[PDB]
Amino acid sequence: DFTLRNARMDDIDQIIKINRLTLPENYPYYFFVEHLKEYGLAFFVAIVDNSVVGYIMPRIEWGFSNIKQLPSLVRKGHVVSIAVLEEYRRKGIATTLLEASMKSMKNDYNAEEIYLEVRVSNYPAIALYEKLNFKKVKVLKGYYADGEDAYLMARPL
Ligand SMILES: CC(=O)SCCNC(=O)CCNC(=O)[C@H](O)C(C)(C)COP(=O)(O)OP(=O)(O)OC[C@H]1O[C@@H](n2cnc3c(N)ncnc32)[C@H](O)[C@@H]1OP(=O)(O)O
Ligand SMILES: [Zn+2]
């Protein structure tokens, strides 16, 4: 099994190892800390055997909606990053991480929608998001450094 808690400063070292193990977008350490500091209530880690094996890093933004047809300002949550170590996958960890963060985005930060980008070939992540009722909003052409497209995916909270 596993447990969930809010991320702390001393988790950063492990969050970074997980990020570099699982994703090509390898942010600097200060990028993680700023999100921990500013939006920490929605920033969660998954713990197995006393170690972090998964994380979700949020940002709460103010600006134009990804959902509403006409240009309108909203508080929107942004899943900047989420990852789970390979050996602990398919156990419901990312689902739980996402759910906890979405709840905090709504209850702590009063966000009314949540969004993210994901590589079009990332079927496990896309499946994960769609299972949580995210919808593909549009294709972002050449979004990634290597030129791969992303799906912008979003939903109300
Ligand atoms: C904004 C984001 O950062 S975009 C990038 C996301 N992060 C990454 O891609 C990093 C590498 N990949 C991973 O860490 C993981 O595969 C994650 C984060 C996508 C999923 O973590 P998991 O804990 O394994 O997801 P979880 O166990 O909650 O599974 C939820 C559902 O997603 C789907 N899913 C997860 N993995 C797969 C897979 N390999 N194949 C098909 N569907 C999958 C399933 O529908 C699953 O439910 P089910 O198997 O019971 O039917
Ligand atoms: Zn993003």
Ligand SMILES: [Zn+2]
């Ligand atoms: Zn709270």
